[PDB]
Amino acid sequence: RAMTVALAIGDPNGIGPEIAVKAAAQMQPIVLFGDAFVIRRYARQCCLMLRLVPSAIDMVDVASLPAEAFVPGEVAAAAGTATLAYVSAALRAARAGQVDAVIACPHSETAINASGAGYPGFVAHEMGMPAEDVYLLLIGGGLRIVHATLHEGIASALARLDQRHVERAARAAVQALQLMGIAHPVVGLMGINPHAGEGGLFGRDDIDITEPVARKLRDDGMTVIGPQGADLLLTNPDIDVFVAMYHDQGHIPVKLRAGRHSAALSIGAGVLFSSVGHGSGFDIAGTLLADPAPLLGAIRLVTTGTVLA
Amino acid sequence: RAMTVALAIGDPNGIGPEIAVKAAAQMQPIVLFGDAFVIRRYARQCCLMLRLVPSAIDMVDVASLPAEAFVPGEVAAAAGTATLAYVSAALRAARAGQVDAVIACPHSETAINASGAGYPGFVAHEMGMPAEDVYLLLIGGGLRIVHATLHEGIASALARLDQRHVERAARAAVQALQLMGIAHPVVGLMGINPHAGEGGLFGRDDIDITEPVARKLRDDGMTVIGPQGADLLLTNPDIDVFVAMYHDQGHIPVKLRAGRHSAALSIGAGVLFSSVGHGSGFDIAGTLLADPAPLLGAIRLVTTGTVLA
Ligand SMILES: [Zn+2]
Ligand SMILES: [Zn+2]
């Protein structure tokens, strides 16, 4: 099949629009979201048709930036407010079944400050849910791990965990992988306790949370391995995606394997989301000097669930 | 330098004595501990001198098994009680500065039951300390990780952790590696919380336990990296040994890297200890059919801190 991927062009005065058009020109999934006048500046410079666009380079005009403000590259309140307008519109499109994945192109933290930014939670807000219901899916070195809990003290995460998060984390990951072309993803649930509690010997958290969720998912047809001690489970190459119960459980193995050749998307909000930004290339903006590679990386991540090494 | 390694021959009616003599014959470290008459049966069969032995094949006679009971291979109360006598004597020798490491050769769980076994804690008892003060050092794939806490619920381990365990785990690992020929081992302390608590943001466990221990060890001259988020730390090849704060933190990365090509010793009791046993080869005992490989594996583990892949 083909996913449709929205690229929100990022800071209009930055490098985003340039790499967004560059990525789209090269190009099994692409619909740009941004001020059409901003995108056109860059397209003419290196190109094909551009159609304002239901379905059928394609772009959706999201009107934000005063023309007066378009100068590559400084930024202003308006260009910071625009970056988020584009993301907002791309997420609205996802809500309307139009778009499968949203990629946020590089932005400027100083411009967003100027306007009156942090995506996973901005995404959560827009989508009508708390931050805790969006889950980080970390990919690299042939591993894909969604995290039921993330940035907090491990004594706090253990307390947050319940059947709801583990079930929502697993279903979101299956659906993501299905969109990615993995028809029947094998899910691996990591044990909360070592050895997934060893028949109650190490406590009853797995008996309470991951065992009942495992049974429920299997009854809805999914193939689910576990819960099993994470140290055994991750040795199994037959698993397509793993549910880690806390930050370190999934961050250690991906980073050990892949190091820097890894990347993240957020799932659970009813869209595959990722961000590209290592800042807006302001001092090279306009010049067409931007390389699209990091962005083609994110497209690859959301459509394939792999990271090249 | 050279370590001296005690091989406690295991069940006299089993394969232990055979592989113990076989290992010793091949053979930069070896002193057998067992009934001399049991060891001699096997030596004559494939050999060199054997000297009963302070310092200078070498063996220490540990008198346990009635001769009447020596038959390879069935077992009896007496041969189960002998296996543990040999280990006991080897640990006494370690206590007397005579021996650096003790390896327990294969035993028989049914014979030990018959007599009136579980080593890490048997070791702890003999050495005059509780089980919780001996730490598992897990090695493979170029990683060496000592665990401050091990087989219990992760909510229970978090509660057990204190500066004392982390300090004792780190010092024991340094001393082990020094015995192994690593003069100046670089120690890596894993963060209890993700990102080692991110400046208190994720809680204060690292501020309380691993930060003060890190400062203390550095003041006693050791080079200590961390505490740092375990997912970053383990990416550092400059570290010679890591202190994991709970079971999964150290079991995930060693097993991910090395799988089955990994092995464990216990440290912290004032001896490097490991066991070889996958049961006594009773139906092949006598025949000289035993391969010494698993035992040469354990010798390699305790003298070098590596596992061949
Ligand atoms: Zn993190
Ligand atoms: Zn275990």
Coordinates of C-alpha atoms and ligand atoms in Angstrom, one line a residue:
Chain A
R1 CA 0.0 0.0 0.0
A2 CA 1.1 3.6 0.4
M3 CA 1.1 5.8 3.5
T4 CA 0.4 9.5 3.1
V5 CA 2.8 11.6 4.9
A6 CA 2.3 15.3 5.8
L7 CA 5.5 17.4 6.1
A8 CA 4.9 20.5 8.1
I9 CA 7.5 22.7 6.7
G10 CA 8.8 24.2 10.0
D11 CA 10.0 27.7 10.4
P12 CA 9.2 29.5 7.2
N13 CA 12.4 31.6 7.5
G14 CA 14.5 28.5 8.1
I15 CA 15.7 25.5 6.2
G16 CA 12.5 23.5 6.6
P17 CA 10.7 24.6 3.5
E18 CA 13.8 24.0 1.5
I19 CA 14.3 20.4 2.6
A20 CA 10.6 19.8 2.5
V21 CA 10.5 20.7 -1.2
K22 CA 13.8 18.9 -1.7
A23 CA 12.5 15.7 -0.1
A24 CA 9.2 15.9 -2.0
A25 CA 11.1 16.4 -5.3
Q26 CA 13.0 13.3 -4.7
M27 CA 9.9 11.0 -4.9
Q28 CA 6.5 4.2 -1.3
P29 CA 4.5 7.1 0.3
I30 CA 4.0 13.2 0.3
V31 CA 1.9 16.3 1.1
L32 CA 3.5 19.6 2.3
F33 CA 1.7 21.7 4.8
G34 CA 2.8 25.4 4.9
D35 CA 2.2 28.9 3.4
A36 CA 2.0 28.2 -0.3
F37 CA 4.0 31.4 -1.0
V38 CA 6.8 30.1 1.2
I39 CA 6.9 26.7 -0.5
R40 CA 6.7 28.2 -4.0
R41 CA 9.8 30.4 -3.3
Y42 CA 11.8 27.1 -2.9
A43 CA 10.1 25.0 -5.6
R44 CA 10.7 27.5 -8.5
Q45 CA 14.4 27.5 -7.4
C46 CA 14.8 23.8 -8.0
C47 CA 11.8 22.6 -10.1
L48 CA 7.5 20.2 -11.4
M49 CA 3.8 21.0 -10.9
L50 CA 2.7 22.1 -7.4
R51 CA -0.9 21.6 -6.8
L52 CA -2.8 23.1 -4.0
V53 CA -4.9 20.3 -2.7
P54 CA -9.4 15.0 -0.6
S55 CA -6.9 13.5 -2.8
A56 CA -5.4 12.6 -6.2
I57 CA 4.6 18.1 -5.6
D58 CA 1.4 18.3 -3.6
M59 CA 0.7 20.9 -0.9
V60 CA -2.0 22.2 1.4
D61 CA -1.9 25.9 1.9
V62 CA -1.9 26.8 5.6
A63 CA -2.2 30.6 5.7
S64 CA -0.2 32.1 8.6
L65 CA 2.9 34.1 7.7
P66 CA 2.5 37.7 6.6
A67 CA 4.4 38.0 3.3
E68 CA 6.2 41.0 4.9
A69 CA 7.6 38.6 7.4
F70 CA 9.1 36.1 4.9
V71 CA 12.7 36.7 5.0
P72 CA 15.2 33.8 5.1
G73 CA 16.4 33.7 7.6
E74 CA 15.8 35.7 10.6
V75 CA 12.7 34.9 12.6
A76 CA 9.8 36.8 14.1
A77 CA 6.8 36.0 16.4
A78 CA 4.8 35.4 13.1
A79 CA 7.2 32.8 11.7
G80 CA 7.3 30.9 15.1
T81 CA 3.5 31.0 15.2
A82 CA 3.4 29.8 11.6
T83 CA 5.6 26.7 12.3
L84 CA 3.0 25.5 14.8
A85 CA 0.0 26.4 12.6
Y86 CA 1.4 24.0 9.9
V87 CA 1.8 21.2 12.4
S88 CA -1.7 22.0 13.7
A89 CA -3.2 21.7 10.3
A90 CA -1.3 18.5 9.5
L91 CA -2.7 17.0 12.7
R92 CA -6.2 18.1 11.8
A93 CA -5.8 16.3 8.4
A94 CA -4.7 13.2 10.3
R95 CA -7.8 13.5 12.5
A96 CA -9.8 13.6 9.2
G97 CA -8.4 10.3 7.9
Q98 CA -6.4 12.2 5.2
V99 CA -2.9 11.7 6.3
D100 CA -1.2 8.7 8.2
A101 CA 1.9 10.4 9.6
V102 CA 3.0 13.9 10.3
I103 CA 6.6 15.0 10.2
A104 CA 7.5 18.3 11.8
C105 CA 10.4 20.0 9.9
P106 CA 13.2 22.0 11.7
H107 CA 11.9 24.9 13.8
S108 CA 13.3 27.8 15.9
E109 CA 12.9 27.8 19.7
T110 CA 13.6 31.4 19.9
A111 CA 10.8 32.3 17.4
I112 CA 8.4 30.0 19.1
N113 CA 9.3 31.8 22.4
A114 CA 8.7 35.1 20.6
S115 CA 5.1 34.1 19.6
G116 CA 3.2 32.9 22.7
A117 CA 6.8 24.0 20.9
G118 CA 7.5 20.6 22.7
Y119 CA 6.0 18.2 20.2
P120 CA 4.9 15.0 21.8
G121 CA 2.8 17.0 24.2
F122 CA 1.8 19.7 21.7
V123 CA 0.6 16.7 19.6
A124 CA -1.2 15.3 22.6
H125 CA -3.0 18.7 23.3
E126 CA -4.1 19.1 19.7
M127 CA -5.3 15.5 19.6
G128 CA -7.4 15.9 22.7
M129 CA -5.5 13.8 25.2
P130 CA -2.9 14.0 28.0
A131 CA 0.8 13.7 27.3
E132 CA 0.9 10.3 29.2
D133 CA -1.3 8.7 26.5
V134 CA 1.3 9.2 23.7
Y135 CA 4.1 6.7 23.6
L136 CA 7.6 7.0 22.3
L137 CA 8.5 4.3 19.7
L138 CA 12.3 4.1 19.5
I139 CA 13.8 2.4 16.5
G140 CA 17.3 1.3 15.4
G141 CA 19.6 -1.6 14.8
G142 CA 16.7 -3.8 13.8
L143 CA 14.8 -3.1 17.1
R144 CA 11.5 -1.3 17.5
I145 CA 10.4 -0.5 21.1
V146 CA 7.3 1.4 22.3
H147 CA 7.6 2.7 25.9
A148 CA 4.5 2.4 28.3
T149 CA 6.2 4.9 30.5
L150 CA 9.0 7.3 29.8
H151 CA 10.7 10.4 31.4
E152 CA 10.1 10.1 35.1
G153 CA 11.7 8.4 38.1
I154 CA 11.5 4.6 37.7
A155 CA 9.5 4.3 41.3
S156 CA 7.0 6.8 39.7
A157 CA 6.8 5.0 36.3
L158 CA 6.2 1.7 38.1
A159 CA 3.4 3.3 39.9
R160 CA 1.9 4.9 36.7
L161 CA 1.8 1.6 34.8
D162 CA -1.6 -0.1 34.4
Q163 CA -3.3 -2.4 31.9
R164 CA -4.6 0.6 30.0
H165 CA -1.2 2.1 29.0
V166 CA 0.3 -1.3 28.2
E167 CA -2.7 -2.2 26.0
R168 CA -2.8 1.2 24.3
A169 CA 1.1 1.1 23.8
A170 CA 0.8 -2.4 22.2
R171 CA -2.2 -1.6 19.9
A172 CA -0.7 1.7 18.8
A173 CA 2.6 -0.1 17.9
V174 CA 0.7 -2.9 15.9
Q175 CA -1.3 -0.3 14.0
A176 CA 1.9 1.7 13.3
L177 CA 3.7 -1.4 12.0
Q178 CA 0.7 -2.4 9.8
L179 CA 0.8 1.1 8.3
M180 CA 4.5 0.5 7.8
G181 CA 3.8 -2.7 5.8
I182 CA 4.0 -5.3 8.5
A183 CA 0.9 -7.2 8.1
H184 CA 1.1 -9.3 11.1
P185 CA 3.4 -7.9 13.7
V186 CA 4.6 -10.2 16.4
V187 CA 4.5 -8.2 19.7
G188 CA 6.8 -8.9 22.6
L189 CA 5.8 -7.7 26.1
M190 CA 8.7 -7.1 28.5
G191 CA 8.2 -8.3 32.1
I192 CA 7.8 -5.4 34.6
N193 CA 9.7 -7.5 37.1
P194 CA 12.8 -9.6 36.2
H195 CA 11.7 -12.9 34.6
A196 CA 8.2 -11.3 34.3
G197 CA 7.8 -12.0 38.1
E198 CA 8.8 -15.7 37.9
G199 CA 5.3 -17.1 38.7
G200 CA 4.7 -14.5 41.4
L201 CA 8.0 -15.0 43.2
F202 CA 9.3 -11.5 42.4
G203 CA 5.8 -9.9 42.9
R204 CA 2.6 -9.6 41.2
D205 CA 2.9 -6.6 38.8
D206 CA 3.0 -8.9 35.7
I207 CA 0.1 -11.0 37.0
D208 CA -1.9 -7.7 37.4
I209 CA -1.0 -5.8 34.3
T210 CA 1.0 -7.4 31.4
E211 CA -0.5 -11.1 31.7
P212 CA -4.1 -9.9 31.4
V213 CA -3.2 -7.5 28.6
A214 CA -1.4 -10.3 26.8
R215 CA -4.5 -12.6 27.0
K216 CA -6.7 -9.8 25.8
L217 CA -4.7 -8.9 22.8
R218 CA -4.4 -12.6 21.8
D219 CA -8.2 -12.9 22.0
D220 CA -8.4 -10.0 19.6
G221 CA -6.2 -12.1 17.3
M222 CA -2.7 -10.5 17.8
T223 CA 0.3 -12.7 18.2
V224 CA 1.8 -11.8 21.5
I225 CA 5.0 -13.2 23.1
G226 CA 5.3 -12.7 26.9
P227 CA 5.4 -11.1 29.3
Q228 CA 8.9 -12.6 29.5
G229 CA 12.1 -11.3 31.2
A230 CA 13.2 -8.5 29.0
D231 CA 16.8 -10.0 28.9
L232 CA 15.4 -13.2 27.2
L233 CA 12.8 -11.5 25.1
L234 CA 15.0 -9.1 23.3
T235 CA 17.2 -12.1 22.2
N236 CA 14.2 -13.2 20.0
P237 CA 14.6 -12.0 16.4
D238 CA 11.0 -13.2 15.6
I239 CA 9.5 -10.3 17.5
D240 CA 8.6 -7.3 15.2
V241 CA 8.0 -4.7 18.0
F242 CA 8.6 -4.8 21.8
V243 CA 6.7 -2.9 24.6
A244 CA 9.1 -1.7 27.3
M245 CA 7.6 -0.9 30.7
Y246 CA 10.0 1.9 31.5
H247 CA 12.6 4.3 29.8
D248 CA 15.8 2.3 30.5
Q249 CA 14.2 -1.0 29.5
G250 CA 13.8 0.1 26.0
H251 CA 16.5 2.7 25.7
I252 CA 19.4 0.5 26.8
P253 CA 19.0 -2.2 24.0
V254 CA 18.3 0.2 21.1
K255 CA 21.2 2.5 22.0
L256 CA 23.5 -0.5 22.7
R257 CA 22.8 -1.9 19.3
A258 CA 22.4 1.1 17.1
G259 CA 23.9 4.1 19.1
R260 CA 23.4 7.2 17.1
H261 CA 21.8 5.2 14.2
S262 CA 18.4 5.3 15.9
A263 CA 15.4 7.7 15.9
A264 CA 12.0 8.1 17.5
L265 CA 8.3 8.6 16.6
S266 CA 5.3 9.2 18.9
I267 CA 2.3 7.0 18.5
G268 CA -1.0 6.5 20.3
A269 CA -2.6 9.9 19.4
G270 CA -4.1 8.5 16.1
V271 CA -1.1 9.7 14.0
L272 CA 2.5 8.6 13.4
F273 CA 4.4 11.7 14.4
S274 CA 8.1 12.6 14.2
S275 CA 10.2 15.7 14.3
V276 CA 13.3 16.4 12.2
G277 CA 14.8 19.5 13.8
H278 CA 18.3 20.1 14.9
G279 CA 17.5 23.9 14.7
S280 CA 16.6 26.0 11.6
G281 CA 19.6 26.5 9.3
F282 CA 19.2 30.3 9.4
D283 CA 22.7 31.3 8.2
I284 CA 22.3 28.9 5.2
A285 CA 18.6 29.6 4.6
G286 CA 17.8 30.6 1.0
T287 CA 21.1 29.4 -0.4
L288 CA 19.7 26.0 -1.3
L289 CA 22.6 24.6 0.6
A290 CA 20.4 22.4 3.0
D291 CA 20.7 18.7 2.7
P292 CA 17.4 16.8 2.8
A293 CA 19.1 13.6 4.3
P294 CA 17.8 14.0 8.0
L295 CA 14.3 14.5 6.6
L296 CA 14.5 11.6 4.1
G297 CA 15.6 9.8 7.3
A298 CA 12.4 10.6 9.1
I299 CA 10.3 9.7 6.0
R300 CA 12.1 6.3 6.0
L301 CA 11.4 6.0 9.7
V302 CA 7.7 6.6 9.6
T303 CA 7.0 4.5 6.4
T304 CA 9.3 1.6 7.0
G305 CA 10.1 1.5 10.8
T306 CA 13.8 1.2 10.1
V307 CA 16.9 3.4 10.5
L308 CA 19.8 3.0 8.1
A309 CA 23.3 2.1 9.6
Chain B
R1 CA 51.0 -11.8 37.5
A2 CA 49.2 -15.1 38.1
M3 CA 46.0 -15.9 39.9
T4 CA 45.7 -19.1 41.8
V5 CA 42.5 -20.9 41.1
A6 CA 40.9 -23.6 43.3
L7 CA 38.9 -26.2 41.4
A8 CA 36.5 -27.9 43.8
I9 CA 36.0 -31.2 41.9
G10 CA 32.3 -31.5 42.4
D11 CA 30.5 -34.8 42.8
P12 CA 33.2 -37.4 43.2
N13 CA 31.0 -40.0 41.4
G14 CA 30.4 -37.5 38.6
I15 CA 32.3 -36.0 35.8
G16 CA 33.8 -33.2 37.9
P17 CA 37.0 -34.9 38.9
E18 CA 37.6 -36.0 35.4
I19 CA 37.3 -32.5 33.9
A20 CA 39.2 -31.0 36.8
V21 CA 42.2 -33.2 36.1
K22 CA 41.8 -32.8 32.4
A23 CA 41.7 -28.9 32.8
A24 CA 44.7 -29.0 35.1
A25 CA 46.7 -31.3 32.7
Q26 CA 46.2 -28.8 30.0
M27 CA 48.2 -26.0 31.7
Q28 CA 48.3 -17.7 33.1
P29 CA 47.0 -19.1 36.5
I30 CA 45.6 -24.3 39.3
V31 CA 45.0 -26.3 42.6
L32 CA 42.4 -29.1 42.9
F33 CA 40.4 -29.6 46.0
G34 CA 38.9 -33.0 46.5
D35 CA 39.5 -36.5 47.9
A36 CA 43.0 -37.4 46.7
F37 CA 42.0 -41.0 46.0
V38 CA 39.2 -39.7 43.7
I39 CA 41.5 -37.4 41.8
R40 CA 44.3 -40.1 41.5
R41 CA 41.8 -42.5 39.9
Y42 CA 41.5 -40.0 37.1
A43 CA 45.1 -38.7 36.8
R44 CA 46.7 -42.2 36.4
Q45 CA 44.2 -42.8 33.5
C46 CA 45.5 -39.8 31.5
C47 CA 48.9 -38.8 33.0
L48 CA 52.5 -36.1 35.5
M49 CA 53.3 -35.6 39.1
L50 CA 50.5 -35.0 41.6
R51 CA 51.6 -33.3 44.7
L52 CA 49.6 -33.0 47.7
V53 CA 50.1 -29.5 48.9
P54 CA 51.5 -22.8 51.4
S55 CA 52.8 -23.0 47.9
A56 CA 55.3 -23.9 45.3
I57 CA 49.2 -31.2 38.9
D58 CA 48.7 -29.7 42.4
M59 CA 46.0 -30.8 44.8
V60 CA 44.8 -30.3 48.3
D61 CA 43.4 -33.5 49.9
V62 CA 40.0 -32.8 51.4
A63 CA 39.0 -36.0 53.1
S64 CA 35.3 -36.7 52.9
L65 CA 34.1 -39.6 50.7
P66 CA 34.4 -43.2 52.1
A67 CA 36.3 -45.2 49.6
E68 CA 33.5 -47.7 49.7
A69 CA 31.3 -44.9 48.3
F70 CA 33.5 -44.1 45.3
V71 CA 31.7 -45.5 42.4
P72 CA 31.4 -43.7 39.1
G73 CA 28.7 -42.9 38.7
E74 CA 25.8 -43.3 41.0
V75 CA 25.6 -41.0 44.0
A76 CA 25.0 -41.3 47.7
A77 CA 24.5 -39.0 50.7
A78 CA 28.3 -39.1 51.2
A79 CA 29.2 -38.0 47.7
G80 CA 26.8 -35.1 47.9
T81 CA 28.2 -34.1 51.3
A82 CA 31.7 -34.4 49.7
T83 CA 31.0 -32.0 46.9
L84 CA 30.2 -29.3 49.4
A85 CA 33.1 -30.2 51.7
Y86 CA 35.5 -29.5 48.7
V87 CA 33.9 -26.1 48.1
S88 CA 34.0 -25.4 51.8
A89 CA 37.8 -26.1 51.9
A90 CA 38.5 -24.1 48.8
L91 CA 36.7 -21.1 50.4
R92 CA 38.6 -21.6 53.6
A93 CA 41.8 -21.4 51.5
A94 CA 40.6 -18.2 49.8
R95 CA 39.9 -16.8 53.4
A96 CA 43.6 -17.6 54.2
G97 CA 45.0 -15.7 51.2
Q98 CA 46.0 -18.8 49.5
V99 CA 43.6 -18.9 46.5
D100 CA 42.1 -16.0 44.5
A101 CA 39.2 -17.7 42.9
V102 CA 37.1 -20.8 43.5
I103 CA 35.4 -22.8 40.8
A104 CA 32.8 -25.3 41.7
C105 CA 32.8 -28.3 39.3
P106 CA 29.5 -30.0 38.3
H107 CA 27.5 -31.5 41.1
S108 CA 24.3 -33.6 41.7
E109 CA 21.2 -32.0 43.2
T110 CA 19.8 -35.3 44.0
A111 CA 22.9 -36.3 46.0
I112 CA 23.0 -33.0 47.8
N113 CA 19.3 -33.5 48.7
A114 CA 20.3 -37.0 50.0
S115 CA 22.9 -35.6 52.4
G116 CA 21.3 -32.8 54.5
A117 CA 23.7 -26.6 47.4
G118 CA 22.7 -23.1 45.9
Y119 CA 26.2 -21.6 45.6
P120 CA 26.1 -17.8 45.7
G121 CA 24.4 -18.1 49.1
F122 CA 26.3 -21.2 50.3
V123 CA 29.3 -19.0 49.5
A124 CA 27.8 -16.1 51.4
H125 CA 27.1 -18.4 54.5
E126 CA 30.6 -19.9 54.5
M127 CA 32.2 -16.4 54.1
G128 CA 30.2 -15.0 57.1
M129 CA 27.8 -12.7 55.3
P130 CA 24.2 -12.4 54.1
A131 CA 23.4 -13.4 50.5
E132 CA 22.6 -9.8 49.7
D133 CA 26.3 -8.8 50.1
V134 CA 27.5 -11.0 47.2
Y135 CA 27.0 -9.6 43.8
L136 CA 26.6 -11.2 40.4
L137 CA 29.2 -10.1 37.9
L138 CA 27.8 -11.0 34.4
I139 CA 30.2 -11.1 31.4
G140 CA 29.9 -11.4 27.7
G141 CA 30.3 -9.7 24.4
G142 CA 33.0 -7.4 25.7
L143 CA 30.7 -6.2 28.6
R144 CA 31.3 -6.8 32.3
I145 CA 28.4 -5.8 34.7
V146 CA 28.2 -6.3 38.5
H147 CA 24.6 -6.0 39.8
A148 CA 23.9 -4.1 43.1
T149 CA 20.6 -5.8 43.4
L150 CA 19.4 -9.0 41.6
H151 CA 16.5 -11.4 41.8
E152 CA 13.6 -9.6 43.3
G153 CA 10.8 -7.3 42.3
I154 CA 12.1 -4.2 40.8
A155 CA 10.0 -1.9 43.5
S156 CA 11.8 -4.1 46.2
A157 CA 15.3 -3.8 44.6
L158 CA 14.9 0.0 44.4
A159 CA 14.1 0.0 48.0
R160 CA 17.0 -2.2 48.9
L161 CA 19.6 -0.1 47.1
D162 CA 21.8 2.1 49.3
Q163 CA 25.3 3.6 49.1
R164 CA 26.7 0.6 50.9
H165 CA 25.7 -1.9 48.2
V166 CA 26.7 0.3 45.3
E167 CA 30.1 1.0 46.9
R168 CA 30.7 -2.6 47.8
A169 CA 29.6 -3.8 44.3
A170 CA 32.0 -1.2 42.6
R171 CA 35.0 -2.0 44.9
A172 CA 34.5 -5.8 44.5
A173 CA 34.4 -5.4 40.7
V174 CA 37.6 -3.2 40.6
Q175 CA 39.5 -5.7 42.8
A176 CA 38.2 -8.6 40.6
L177 CA 39.4 -6.9 37.4
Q178 CA 42.8 -6.0 39.0
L179 CA 43.2 -9.8 39.8
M180 CA 42.2 -10.4 36.1
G181 CA 45.1 -8.2 34.9
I182 CA 43.3 -4.8 34.5
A183 CA 45.5 -2.5 36.4
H184 CA 43.3 0.5 36.3
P185 CA 39.7 -0.4 35.6
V186 CA 37.4 2.4 34.5
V187 CA 34.1 1.9 36.4
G188 CA 30.8 3.1 35.0
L189 CA 27.9 3.7 37.4
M190 CA 24.4 3.3 35.9
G191 CA 21.8 5.9 36.9
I192 CA 19.0 4.5 39.1
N193 CA 16.6 6.8 37.4
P194 CA 16.7 7.5 33.6
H195 CA 19.4 10.0 32.8
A196 CA 20.7 9.4 36.4
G197 CA 17.8 11.6 37.6
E198 CA 18.4 14.6 35.2
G199 CA 19.6 17.0 37.9
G200 CA 16.8 15.9 40.4
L201 CA 14.0 16.3 37.8
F202 CA 13.2 12.5 37.9
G203 CA 13.8 12.2 41.6
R204 CA 16.6 12.1 44.0
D205 CA 17.8 8.5 44.2
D206 CA 21.0 9.2 42.3
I207 CA 21.7 12.3 44.3
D208 CA 21.3 10.1 47.5
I209 CA 23.2 7.0 46.5
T210 CA 25.2 6.8 43.3
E211 CA 26.5 10.5 43.2
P212 CA 28.0 10.3 46.8
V213 CA 29.4 6.9 46.1
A214 CA 31.0 8.1 42.8
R215 CA 32.7 11.0 44.7
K216 CA 34.0 8.7 47.4
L217 CA 35.5 6.2 45.0
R218 CA 37.2 9.0 43.0
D219 CA 38.7 10.3 46.2
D220 CA 40.2 6.9 46.8
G221 CA 41.7 7.2 43.4
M222 CA 39.4 5.2 41.2
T223 CA 38.4 6.5 37.8
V224 CA 34.6 6.5 37.9
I225 CA 32.3 7.6 35.0
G226 CA 28.7 8.5 36.1
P227 CA 26.2 8.0 37.4
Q228 CA 24.9 8.5 33.9
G229 CA 21.7 7.3 32.1
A230 CA 22.5 3.6 31.5
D231 CA 21.5 3.9 27.8
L232 CA 24.3 6.5 27.2
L233 CA 26.8 4.9 29.5
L234 CA 26.8 1.4 28.0
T235 CA 27.6 3.0 24.6
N236 CA 31.1 3.9 26.1
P237 CA 33.8 1.4 25.1
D238 CA 36.3 3.1 27.5
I239 CA 34.5 1.6 30.5
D240 CA 36.0 -1.7 31.8
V241 CA 33.2 -2.7 34.2
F242 CA 29.7 -1.3 34.9
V243 CA 27.6 -1.3 38.1
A244 CA 23.9 -2.0 37.2
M245 CA 21.4 -0.9 39.9
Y246 CA 18.9 -3.8 39.1
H247 CA 18.7 -7.2 37.3
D248 CA 17.3 -6.0 33.9
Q249 CA 19.6 -3.0 33.7
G250 CA 22.6 -5.3 33.4
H251 CA 21.0 -8.5 32.0
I252 CA 19.4 -6.8 29.0
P253 CA 22.7 -5.5 27.5
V254 CA 24.9 -8.5 28.1
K255 CA 22.3 -10.9 26.8
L256 CA 21.5 -8.6 23.8
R257 CA 25.1 -8.6 22.9
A258 CA 26.4 -12.0 23.7
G259 CA 23.3 -14.2 24.2
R260 CA 24.4 -17.6 25.3
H261 CA 28.1 -16.6 25.0
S262 CA 28.1 -15.1 28.5
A263 CA 28.7 -16.4 32.0
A264 CA 28.6 -15.2 35.6
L265 CA 30.8 -15.1 38.7
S266 CA 30.0 -14.0 42.3
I267 CA 32.1 -11.3 43.9
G268 CA 32.0 -9.4 47.1
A269 CA 32.7 -12.3 49.5
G270 CA 36.5 -11.9 49.3
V271 CA 36.7 -14.6 46.6
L272 CA 36.0 -14.8 42.8
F273 CA 33.5 -17.6 42.6
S274 CA 31.9 -19.4 39.7
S275 CA 30.2 -22.7 39.1
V276 CA 30.5 -25.0 36.1
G277 CA 27.7 -27.4 36.5
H278 CA 25.0 -28.5 34.0
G279 CA 24.7 -31.7 36.1
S280 CA 27.1 -34.5 36.8
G281 CA 27.7 -36.7 33.7
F282 CA 26.8 -39.9 35.6
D283 CA 26.2 -42.1 32.5
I284 CA 29.5 -41.1 31.0
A285 CA 31.5 -41.0 34.4
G286 CA 34.6 -43.1 34.4
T287 CA 34.8 -43.4 30.6
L288 CA 37.0 -40.3 30.2
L289 CA 34.5 -39.1 27.7
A290 CA 34.0 -35.8 29.5
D291 CA 35.1 -32.7 27.6
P292 CA 36.8 -30.1 29.8
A293 CA 35.7 -27.1 27.6
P294 CA 32.9 -25.7 30.0
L295 CA 35.5 -25.7 32.8
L296 CA 38.3 -24.2 30.8
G297 CA 35.5 -21.6 30.0
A298 CA 35.1 -20.9 33.7
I299 CA 38.9 -20.7 34.2
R300 CA 39.1 -18.2 31.3
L301 CA 36.2 -16.3 32.9
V302 CA 37.7 -15.8 36.3
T303 CA 41.3 -15.1 35.1
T304 CA 40.6 -12.9 32.2
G305 CA 37.0 -11.6 32.6
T306 CA 36.1 -12.5 29.1
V307 CA 33.9 -15.2 27.3
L308 CA 34.9 -16.4 23.9
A309 CA 32.4 -16.0 21.0
Ligands
ZN1 ZN 15.6 9.8 27.8
ZN2 ZN 17.8 -13.6 36.2

